[PDB]
């Protein structure tokens, strides 16, 4: 996970996926928190 650039577009530094809305990025983020 590399810290990206402060961009409105909800960007995921965990994998590198960009989203327009939050709810979308959220559900996608939860997936990352699997092992932990
Ligand atoms: Zn991600």
Descriptive account of the structure:
This is Zinc finger protein ZFAT. A zinc finger (C2H2-type) spans 10-32. It comes from Homo sapiens (Human). May be involved in transcriptional regulation. Overexpression causes down-regulation of a number of genes involved in the immune response. Some genes are also up-regulated. Zn(2+) 12 binds at residues 12, 15, 28, 31. Helices cover 31% and strands 0% of the residues. It is mainly alpha-helical. It has one domain (1-36). The longest helix has 11 residues, at 22-32. The protein is flat. It starts with 21 loop residues before the first helix and ends with a helix. Zinc ion is lined by residues 12, 14-15, 17, 28-29, 32.
